[PDB]
């Protein structure tokens, strides 16, 4: 049972605890300052804070919060998070399962959540969820982040607090089942409106890739918008859909494996040429086919640069965290967005900037508005580097709308190199 898995740490209540992690010294100030620097503003906030331990976030939280409901089922954690926070006074406590927590409805502007759905069967998931739409005002936000794949200190198995003469209960789920399961979620309130949860994105905590080499810490923030089209309402339906979205991302990995992007030969020769401070951007949503992608990786070698990639297809975003896992290339980073605009929606709200971008599709796969918009995030005059399908360049050059912010200088046939069909490279620049 979970509570006998973490009840039996009732005398530790302590960081290292919280993270599992005998070393969790090295890690909490920067794994918190990760997660916090990605939420919303939250001063004036309800918050209610599951699974909270000894409240860590808690505790900042409370800082700028209007209130904070602090709760887990572990009563003597609960009796630490009250020690470490009794300067606060806009902060209550409830020992309860997350389940059972009592909160009003429409009442929450954030429920955050760090390493919990692990710790729920595939039914207290999704009954979770469900709840969490209950709590929200509308508009809210939902923060959850998980261990995906494997536990958080990895193969080594350095500082972990699991015993290796014990079983690990523990449910170590495939970040693209959660993904899929916050998509495609939707609950129906007491007067008849339907909800969606708005996953803005889904990224890997980057204090574990780069103090654990561990890109599987993966977390989401998502916003609770109004649905009248459903993905599933039904529970049953909905827990059945997780098994089978592992399913298909196993058969995913036994397609994907090993297999190198036909457009990598293209990619490595011009930017080999091509001298781009930031970092780089990488877009590749795999429209026409799961084998023309960016190889994130031999942009990082050759360029020396940190890159950050987004994959739009949870399938294809999940199998690009396994390599990153697999080359322990701290330079790469991979994301989630549902598509080009909310990936500039985030960055652009942090004010980041990249210096370049590589892409396969990048025309093929987005709007005219969203193409425009790319330039918020980018430094001046950064230049475009997309592989292209087509019927032709007359084709492409007929229904494709230059941003009036970029030029093309350049539209090149490479169909003789993207092979294992026209294929174009395009090179564009800012204005
Ligand atoms: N079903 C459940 N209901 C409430 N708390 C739970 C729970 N399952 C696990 N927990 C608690 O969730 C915590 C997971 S460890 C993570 C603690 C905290 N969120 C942090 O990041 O620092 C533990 O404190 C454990 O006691």
């Given at each position: 049972t979970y509570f006998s898995f973490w009840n039996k740490f009732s005398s530790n209540a302590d960081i290292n605890t919280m993270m599992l992690n005998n070393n969790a010294d090295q890690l909490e100030p920067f794994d918190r300052a990760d997660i916090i620097q990605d939420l919303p503003d939250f001063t004036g906030m309800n918050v209610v804070d599951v699974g909270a331990g000894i409240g860590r976030f808690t505790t900042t939280f409370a800082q700028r919060a209007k209130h904070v409901v602090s709760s887990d089922f572990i009563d003597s954690f609960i009796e630490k998070n009250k020690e470490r926070n009794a300067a606060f006074e806009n902060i209550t406590y409830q020992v309860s399962d997350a389940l059972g927590l009592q909160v009003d409805p429409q009442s929450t502007d954030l429920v955050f959540t760090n390493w919990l759905l692990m710790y729920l069967n595939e039914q207290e998931c999704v009954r979770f969820l469900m709840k969490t739409m209950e709590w929200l005002k509308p508009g809210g936000y939902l923060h959850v982040r998980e261990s995906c794949t494997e536990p958080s200190t990895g193969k080594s198995k350095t500082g972990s607090m699991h015993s290796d003469k014990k079983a690990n209960p523990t449910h170590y789920r495939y970040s693209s089942v959660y993904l899929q399961l916050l998509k495609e979620l939707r609950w129906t309130d007491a007067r008849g409106m339907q909800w969606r949860f708005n996953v803005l994105w889904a990224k890997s905590v980057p204090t574990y890739v780069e103090?654990?080499?561990?890109?599987?810490q993966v977390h989401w923030l998502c916003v609770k918008v109004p649905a009248?089209?459903?993905?599933?309402?039904?529970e049953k339906a909905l827990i059945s859909a997780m098994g089978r979205w592992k399913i298909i991302q196993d058969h995913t990995e036994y397609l994907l494996n090993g297999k190198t992007s036909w457009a990598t030969d293209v990619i490595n020769n011009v930017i080999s040429k091509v001298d781009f401070n930031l970092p780089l951007y990488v877009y590749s949503p795999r429209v026409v086919s799961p084998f023309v992608f960016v190889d994130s990786h031999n942009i990082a070698a050759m360029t020396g640069l940190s890159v950050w990639a987004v994959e739009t297809n949870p399938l294809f975003y999940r199998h690009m965290l396994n390599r990153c896992v697999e080359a322990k290339d701290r330079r790469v980073q991979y994301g989630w967005n549902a598509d080009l605009q909310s990936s500039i929606n985030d960055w652009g709200l942090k004010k980041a900037r990249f210096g370049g971008v590589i892409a396969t599709e990048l025309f093929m796969a987005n709007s005219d508005t969203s193409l425009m918009a790319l330039?918020?995030?980018?430094?001046?005059?950064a230049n475009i580097f997309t592989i292209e399908p087509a019927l032709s360049i007359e084709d492409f050059k007929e229904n494709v709308v230059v941003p009036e912010n970029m030029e093309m200088i350049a539209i090149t046939d490479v169909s003789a190199y993207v092979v294992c069909p026209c294929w174009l490279l395009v090179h564009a620049r800012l204005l």
């Open positions: 103090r654990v080499l561990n890109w599987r009248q089209d459903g993905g599933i309402s039904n330039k918020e995030i980018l430094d001046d005059n």
